[PDB]
UniProtKB/Swiss-Prot annotation:
Domain Beta/gamma crystallin 'Greek key', residue spans: 1-39, 40-82, 87-127, 128-170
Gene3D superfamilies: Crystallins (2.60.20.10)
Listed InterPro entries: Beta/Gamma-Crystallin, Beta/gamma_crystallin, G_crystallin-like
Designated name of the protein: Gamma-crystallin D
Cross-referenced SUPFAM superfamilies: gamma-Crystallin-like
Organism: Homo sapiens (Human)
UniProt record similarity statement: Belongs to the beta/gamma-crystallin family.
Domains: entry comment: Has a two-domain beta-structure, folded into four very similar Greek key motifs.
Stretches the record annotates as Connecting peptide: 83-86
Outcome following mutation: P23S: In CTRCT4; reduces solubility
Function: Crystallins are the dominant structural components of the vertebrate eye lens.
C-alpha cells in the first residue's frame, strides 16, 4: 500500500508518504487536510497510537478532510489494512460472546433489521477486516475491526456500544 498525506487542502504543502503503519505522524505533519491513496486500504486516526476518531480511506484522491468524512484536519497515525477475499463476523448482544448472535459475511446498511438491538456488546472477527459505524447507512463514528476477538465495545475504540451499520473492507 501507499498513501501520501498533505498538510494543506488540494495536495499542497508539506507531505509524508507511508507504506506501513505509522503510530505518530507529528514529526512529519502539523495537520492533514488532503490525501492521495495510491494503493491499499487505510485507516486514519485523529490521535497517535491508532486512537481517537477513525476514518477509512481507499484508492483515490481526498482534496480536503471532509472527503474522508473527517471532522477536522487532525491525522496523527495511520494503519494499512490487509486485503481479504472473504469476510465473516459474529456480533453479540452481550459482552463476552453471550446473548443473541448474528453472523454476517456481507455488508449491512441497517444492523437493526435482523440484529434487533441498538448496541453490539462483543464480536468475533473470523475473516477479513470490517468497519463498524455508529449510525445506519455508514454514518457517524467509524471503528475498524480486524481478525480476532473483541469482548467489549472499548476493545474496538468506541465510547459506547451503539452500532447502526457495518461493512467489509474491500478494495474494489
Amino acid at each position: 500500500g501507499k498513501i501520501t498525506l498533505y498538510e494543506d487542502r488540494g495536495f499542497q504543502g508539506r507531505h509524508y508518504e507511508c507504506s506501513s503503519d505509522h503510530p505518530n505522524l507529528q514529526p512529519y505533519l502539523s495537520r492533514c487536510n488532503s490525501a492521495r491513496v495510491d494503493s491499499g486500504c487505510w485507516m486514519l486516526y485523529e490521535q497517535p497510537n491508532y486512537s481517537g476518531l477513525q476514518y477509512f480511506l481507499r484508492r483515490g484522491d481526498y482534496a480536503d478532510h471532509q472527503q474522508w468524512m473527517g471532522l477536522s484536519d487532525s491525522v496523527r497515525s495511520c494503519r494499512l489494512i490487509p486485503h481479504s477475499g472473504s469476510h465473516r463476523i459474529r456480533l453479540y448482544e452481550r459482552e463476552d460472546y453471550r446473548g443473541q448472535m448474528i453472523e454476517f459475511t456481507e455488508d449491512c446498511s441497517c444492523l437493526q433489521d435482523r440484529f434487533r438491538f441498538n448496541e453490539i456488546h462483543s464480536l468475533n472477527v473470523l475473516e477479513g477486516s470490517w468497519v463498524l459505524y455508529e449510525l445506519s447507512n455508514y454514518r457517524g463514528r467509524q471503528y475498524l475491526l480486524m481478525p480476532g476477538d473483541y469482548r467489549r465495545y472499548q476493545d474496538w475504540g468506541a465510547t459506547d456500544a451503539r452500532v447502526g451499520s457495518l461493512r467489509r473492507v474491500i478494495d474494489f
